[PDB]
Amino acid sequence: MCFIVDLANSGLIHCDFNEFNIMICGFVVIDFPQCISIQHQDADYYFQRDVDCIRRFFKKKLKYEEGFGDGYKYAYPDFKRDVKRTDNLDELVQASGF
Amino acid sequence: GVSVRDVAAQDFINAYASFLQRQGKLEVPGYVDIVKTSSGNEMPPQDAEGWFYKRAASVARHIYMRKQVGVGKLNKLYGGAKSRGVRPYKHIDASGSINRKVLQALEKIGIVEISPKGGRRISENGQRDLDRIAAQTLEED
Amino acid sequence: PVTLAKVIKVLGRTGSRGGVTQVRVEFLEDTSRTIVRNVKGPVRENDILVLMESEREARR
Amino acid sequence: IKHTLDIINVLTDQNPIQVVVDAITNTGPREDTTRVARRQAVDVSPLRRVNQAIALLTIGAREAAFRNIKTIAETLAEELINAAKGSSTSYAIKKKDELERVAKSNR
Amino acid sequence: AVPSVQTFGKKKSATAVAHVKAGKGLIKVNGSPITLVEPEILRFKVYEPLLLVGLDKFSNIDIRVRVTGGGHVSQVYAIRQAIAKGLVAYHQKYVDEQSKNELKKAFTSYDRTLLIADSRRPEPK
Amino acid sequence: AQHAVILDQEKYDRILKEVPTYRYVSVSVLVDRLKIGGSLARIALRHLEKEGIIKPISKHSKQAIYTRA
RNA sequence: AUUGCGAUAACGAACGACCUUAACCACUAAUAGUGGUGCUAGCAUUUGCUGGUUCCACUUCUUAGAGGGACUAGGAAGGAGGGGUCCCUUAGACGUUCUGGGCCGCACGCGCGCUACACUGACGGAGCCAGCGAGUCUAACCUUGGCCGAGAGGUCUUGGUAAUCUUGUGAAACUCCGUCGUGCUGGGGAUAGAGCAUUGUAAUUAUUGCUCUUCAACGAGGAAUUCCUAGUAAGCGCAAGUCAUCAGCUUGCGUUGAUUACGUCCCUGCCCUGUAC
C-alpha cells in the first residue's frame, strides 16, 4: 500500500500494479507498461483499481483483510489523502497528461 | 372402452407398480440394493425398496405398445451418458443382468410370452390385465 | 423538462466510424421551430425523440 | 417466464403483463455519449431505447441469482417490480442514471 | 365409399400425415388422444387450429395423424400444419367454396405458417 | 452461524404464527426470513398446505408458489 | 472492368475477364408407403376403438432418374461453388540380416485444445425423438435373438455382397416427479493403491475397459488477442478416416436455436488516378 502512495507523491500512477508484475520487504516491481502522470483526467479511476486489485488478492488467497491496515490508525490509502506533489518526476518523462 | 394408450405415461406406471407390489408374486433377484443398474451410473437407485417393481411395470407397457422386443434393445433404451472423467461424454448401455431377470419374472406370472421371430410379445392375459388397470386410473379422476 | 420531436427527414451518416446519424426534427408541441440533431441508434421518419436539452444544434 | 408472471400477480396485484411494459418504458436511457480523446453527448433512437432496457433488466437478474438461494424467477420478478417503481434499489435504474449524468457533464 | 382426403405437413425433417373422413369428432396422434401430446409447455401450440376456428367445426369428422421423423419440437409444428391443411381440403371438396375461404381467412390472419412451410434449409458447405 | 436442520419446539411455534402473515411464500422465503435449512422448508410447505393454512397456485418441484389464503 | 454516349488526323483490328446446386411442377419405378379384404386378440357392447398375421387396389407422401419453369420485376430466388523433375569413387562400399533399446526422457519458453469453478445445477427414477455413412466366401466383416456374469465380458445360433439384414442405428442435450441447501459442499476428478478382463509373438517405463479406495489446483481469470451477420454463432451427440489394439484429432451429418448492424474509413491492410529522379 505504501508503495503506491510514494509513486503518487512523485507524480506517477502505475496502470496495472498487480500480481502479474510483482516478484517476491522482499518484493520488487519488474515492469511499468503504459504508466501515466498524476495530472491525467482519469488518475483517480485508475488509482482506485490498483488499491482494489491488491485488496482482492489478500482477501481471496491470504484471507487477510505511517502505514495502513491493522495496527495503523487509517485502514488503507485514498486518492485525496497522502498525495502531495512531492517531486514531479512526470515532467522528466512526459508520461501522459503534460 | 379404454386402452393403455388412453392414459398418461407416468401415471399408468405409478399405478401399476403399486398394484404389482401388493400382489407379491413378482420374484425379486435378491442382489437388489447392491447393483447400480448401469455401468454409466454413479450411486445405486435412490428408492431402495420400490425400484424393481417400477421397472417391471415400465417394461410391460413398453412391450404392449410394440410388436416384440429383446433384451439387447432394452439395454439401449435405458442407457445414458457416462462422464469419462476429463474426456468428453459418451453413450453407454445399461446392465443386461437386471433386464433379463425382469423379463423372466414377468413371464412366470404370465403377462408375457416368447414370440416367433425371437424376443417377447404380450400375452392375451397381459392385455386383459393392463387394460383393467387403465380403466381404474381414469375412473379415479 | 422533456420535449418530444418528430423526425421529418434523415440527412446522412456522420462521425469517425459512421456510428451517428444526423436528422432534421420538428417539434411536436408546435410545428416549425425545426432543429437538427445527432441520433445514436437506428432511426426512421416519423420516429419520436425525447430532447432533454432544447436550445442546442448539431455541428456544422 | 411462466413462473415469473405468477409471482408478480401475488406481490402487488396488477395485471402482470402491464408491469412488464412499465419496466421497459421506465428503464431505457434517453441520452448517451460517443467517442470523438473526448466524449460528445448525443440523442438515442426509440428502437435502441427498447433494446437497452431489455438487456439491463436480464443482466441485473442474472448476476443477482448467481451463487444464490433465490431462483431466477424470484430475482427477475423482483427486478421488474422495483423498476416499475422509481426505486433506485434496482440494478437497471442505477445504470440508466450514470449514463445520463455523464452525458450531461459532456454536452 | 366414404368422403375422405389425406394431406401432409412439414417442418424441418418431421413429416406429419393426416387422414380426414366423415364421422364423430375424434382427434388422435399415433393412436393417442391429442390431450396427451408432449411436451406439456407446447401443448397449446396444437390446440390453435381447433380453438381459432371453433370446436363446432369438427363434430362431423375424424382426424388421425402420424408424425415420423424430426425432433421433439419440430414435429409439434408439423402436426398443427397437417390438421389445418386437412380441414380446408375436406371443405373444398364436400361443401361450398364460401366456407373454404372463411377458414383460410381465419388461419392466415393468425399465423401464415399454418398453411405454408417456412422453407428454411440448412446452409451448404 | 448455520441454518437449523432439526426442528426445535420454539421454531415450530414460531412457524405457525408467522407464516400466515406473508403475501407470498416459497422455499427461498422460509430460508431467508426464517432460518431453517432448505430441507426443512420442503417439508414445512407440504405440511402447512395439507393443514390448509396456505393456498397453492402452482407446483413444479423446481419452483413452488403459495399465497396468504 | 478497355463497361458506353459523343467529340474528331485518324480508320479498322487482337488475349484475359459455361457449367453444377437450392426451387416448383407432367414421367418413372417399387427393395418405399397407404387403403381395402380374409383370419384373429383385448376393451365396450349404437357396433364401435386400439392392435397382430393371406391376398387385392393405388403412387398423394418417399424414392431416384429423367423433362420444363426472371429478364432489373412485387416475388421460391432480384444466390453459392468449379520455379520444379563432362568429371570423382568402387571390396565386402555409398551392403544383407538378428536380438535388445529410443522416437513417449523435462528447471523452462511459445501455441492449438479438453474438463471445470455449480442451483439457468449435481444425483436417482420415469418419458422419449434424427440425418449423413459403413459392412464377409479371398473368407470371417457389420451383428439380431436365447443363456451366464455386479460390470467389463463370455457362450450357442441367425440375417446381410445390402432402399431388402445390423437399423425405426429407441443418440445426447431435452421434458416430468423426488433427494441435496449454499458449506472448495453431494461442485471438480488430477495424483495414487489393490483386484478382475480384452487385443497382440510380446503390455515392465504399463493399449484399452470395469470395481472399491485416495480427493490436488480451481471462488469467472492482467497486459495482450481469435472467429462471426440467419436455420448463421453457440450448446449437444453420431458416422467415417487411420486401424490387431489404441483419440481429448480431422472431415461430414443431424438435434435445440439467440443477441446486435444493414454502416464507415478512426485503427490494420489492399487497389486506382510534380519531377532526370
Side-chain angles (χ1 to χ4, degrees):
Chain A
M1 304 316 292
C2 86
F3 184 89
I4 302 178
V5 177
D6 292 347
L7 281 179
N9 271 282
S10 300
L12 294 174
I13 286 177
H14 200 301
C15 185
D16 293 284
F17 183 74
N18 67 47
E19 70 275 11
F20 285 90
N21 52 54
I22 300 163
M23 286 184 74
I24 307 298
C25 53
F27 69 86
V28 66
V29 185
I30 83 185
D31 58 19
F32 287 78
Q34 66 185 247
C35 179
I36 71 183
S37 75
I38 196 61
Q39 305 196 154
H40 190 282
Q41 65 188 0
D42 300 325
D44 67 327
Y45 165 84
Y46 288 113
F47 184 93
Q48 74 189 7
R49 268 173 54 166
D50 288 341
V51 167
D52 288 341
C53 189
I54 204 77
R55 285 170 72 237
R56 286 171 190 278
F57 187 85
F58 276 94
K59 179 171 63 176
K60 201 74 65 180
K61 261 68 181 181
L62 288 308
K63 315 302 185 185
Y64 181 73
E65 302 195 60
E66 58 172 28
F68 295 103
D70 294 349
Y72 302 95
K73 205 161 290 183
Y74 193 32
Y76 59 89
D78 183 21
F79 181 69
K80 296 192 293 286
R81 260 52 61 173
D82 303 334
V83 179
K84 301 182 66 179
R85 199 81 176 110
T86 51
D87 309 296
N88 62 82
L89 305 184
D90 55 305
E91 295 293 353
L92 278 64
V93 180
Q94 50 179 3
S96 185
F98 171 61
Chain B
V2 177
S3 172
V4 179
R5 282 189 165 88
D6 306 329
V7 193
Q10 67 187 112
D11 197 0
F12 179 88
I13 291 170
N14 300 59
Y16 192 50
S18 188
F19 166 79
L20 192 63
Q21 182 166 199
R22 291 191 303 257
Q23 293 299 93
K25 298 185 181 179
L26 194 293
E27 180 75 328
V28 294
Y31 59 43
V32 176
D33 83 20
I34 295 160
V35 181
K36 287 197 303 184
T37 81
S38 174
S39 60
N41 287 358
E42 180 190 338
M43 313 304 285
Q46 194 161 100
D47 180 15
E49 298 86 355
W51 72 268
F52 194 80
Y53 301 103
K54 197 94 71 177
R55 201 175 206 84
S58 171
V59 170
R61 200 193 81 119
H62 192 278
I63 291 175
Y64 173 101
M65 294 191 175
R66 283 178 176 71
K67 201 164 293 210
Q68 65 275 308
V69 315
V71 174
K73 291 173 197 293
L74 293 180
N75 296 174
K76 193 180 185 74
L77 175 65
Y78 299 117
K82 185 180 68 183
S83 66
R84 298 177 68 240
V86 82
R87 304 192 295 287
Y89 285 81
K90 201 169 68 173
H91 166 71
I92 295 295
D93 296 0
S95 163
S97 189
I98 302 311
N99 290 291
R100 204 199 315 122
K101 292 188 186 291
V102 173
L103 292 179
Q104 291 171 353
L106 289 171
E107 197 281 333
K108 285 181 184 293
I109 63 174
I111 289 162
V112 72
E113 68 172 26
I114 294 176
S115 189
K117 307 185 291 182
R120 273 75 172 200
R121 62 158 64 176
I122 200 75
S123 174
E124 63 267 45
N125 294 293
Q127 291 186 290
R128 182 167 55 77
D129 284 344
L130 274 78
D131 290 349
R132 283 174 177 191
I133 281 84
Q136 291 179 15
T137 303
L138 293 177
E139 186 278 334
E140 192 273 328
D141 291 345
Chain C
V2 296
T3 305
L4 302 186
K6 184 187 295 180
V7 173
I8 63 165
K9 191 180 297 290
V10 62
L11 305 178
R13 297 286 180 144
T14 63
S16 54
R17 293 108 182 175
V20 177
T21 299
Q22 269 190 5
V23 76
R24 184 173 290 140
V25 81
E26 177 171 44
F27 281 75
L28 197 76
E29 183 172 21
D30 60 338
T31 56
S32 80
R33 221 185 84 88
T34 305
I35 192 65
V36 181
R37 282 302 189 94
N38 290 328
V39 176
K40 191 177 173 79
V43 66
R44 292 187 289 185
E45 298 177 30
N46 311 94
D47 290 345
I48 296 177
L49 278 61
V50 188
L51 308 187
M52 190 154 66
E53 168 63 300
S54 181
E55 304 317 288
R56 191 183 190 244
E57 191 174 32
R59 65 182 178 175
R60 44 175 55 260
Chain D
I1 292 301
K2 189 178 186 294
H3 299 312
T4 301
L5 298 176
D6 282 351
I7 297 170
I8 296 171
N9 198 32
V10 180
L11 298 180
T12 81
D13 200 21
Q14 290 93 75
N15 183 349
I17 178 163
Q18 182 65 57
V19 184
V20 176
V21 172
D22 295 353
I24 294 286
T25 57
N26 197 35
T27 300
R30 75 175 77 95
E31 192 185 41
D32 204 349
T33 67
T34 181
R35 291 179 293 152
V36 68
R38 64 184 177 91
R39 286 182 172 84
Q40 175 60 275
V42 296
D43 301 317
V44 60
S45 72
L47 182 58
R48 182 167 174 97
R49 297 188 70 214
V50 176
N51 300 119
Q52 289 291 291
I54 293 175
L56 290 173
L57 290 167
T58 63
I59 288 169
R62 183 176 300 112
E63 293 195 337
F66 191 66
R67 297 170 177 155
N68 68 49
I69 300 90
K70 291 181 177 77
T71 73
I72 314 300
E74 306 259 20
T75 52
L76 183 62
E78 183 170 40
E79 266 287 312
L80 289 170
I81 289 167
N82 283 194
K85 296 170 62 177
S87 190
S88 184
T89 59
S90 63
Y91 168 92
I93 289 291
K94 298 178 182 292
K95 284 283 181 284
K96 191 186 74 171
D97 292 352
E98 286 297 340
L99 291 171
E100 290 183 358
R101 63 149 285 274
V102 170
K104 186 187 71 174
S105 185
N106 282 57
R107 84 164 77 109
Chain E
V2 294
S4 54
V5 298
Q6 65 174 288
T7 58
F8 70 92
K10 301 293 188 74
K11 167 57 179 169
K12 200 185 295 175
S13 193
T15 297
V17 177
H19 292 71
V20 182
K21 69 175 185 178
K24 300 281 81 173
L26 69 90
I27 310 95
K28 294 184 189 288
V29 183
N30 300 328
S32 71
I34 197 157
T35 54
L36 298 178
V37 174
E38 176 186 338
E40 297 74 16
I41 231 302
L42 293 185
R43 194 171 292 152
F44 270 84
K45 196 55 57 192
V46 183
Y47 293 146
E48 276 167 355
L50 314 183
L51 298 177
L52 185 59
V53 66
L55 295 174
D56 179 62
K57 206 66 57 179
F58 296 92
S59 304
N60 298 85
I61 57 177
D62 305 356
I63 316 295
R64 49 175 55 84
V65 188
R66 297 193 180 268
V67 74
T68 319
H72 287 151
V73 178
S74 51
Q75 78 184 1
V76 165
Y77 278 89
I79 68 176
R80 70 195 285 267
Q81 182 178 101
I83 292 168
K85 290 176 67 185
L87 188 68
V88 303
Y90 185 78
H91 281 64
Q92 185 273 350
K93 185 153 60 172
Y94 295 111
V95 301
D96 52 71
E97 301 93 330
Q98 176 174 350
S99 58
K100 180 185 72 85
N101 78 72
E102 288 279 20
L103 292 171
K104 277 196 174 187
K105 191 67 173 182
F107 289 161
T108 64
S109 179
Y110 184 77
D111 177 15
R112 187 186 296 102
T113 305
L114 292 171
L115 286 310
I116 310 180
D118 81 348
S119 78
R120 279 187 282 200
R121 194 177 72 97
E123 183 188 50
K125 299 193 299 96
Chain F
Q2 191 206 278
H3 304 326
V5 300
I6 62 97
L7 186 63
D8 191 14
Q9 186 67 201
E10 302 304 327
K11 276 187 172 66
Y12 176 70
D13 289 339
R14 192 176 177 188
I15 288 163
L16 265 58
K17 73 180 290 279
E18 293 307 312
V19 172
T21 319
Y22 309 146
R23 288 181 68 101
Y24 161 62
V25 303
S26 72
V27 169
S28 188
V29 176
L30 300 185
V31 175
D32 188 359
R33 76 199 303 171
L34 271 62
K35 301 181 70 173
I36 65 177
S39 305
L40 271 179
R42 274 185 283 103
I43 271 55
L45 293 168
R46 292 172 192 154
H47 178 270
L48 291 175
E49 187 278 336
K50 185 176 183 180
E51 192 64 12
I53 292 168
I54 66 180
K55 181 177 178 180
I57 70 164
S58 61
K59 298 184 296 179
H60 183 65
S61 77
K62 298 290 152 61
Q63 183 75 54
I65 307 182
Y66 299 87
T67 75
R68 188 194 297 277

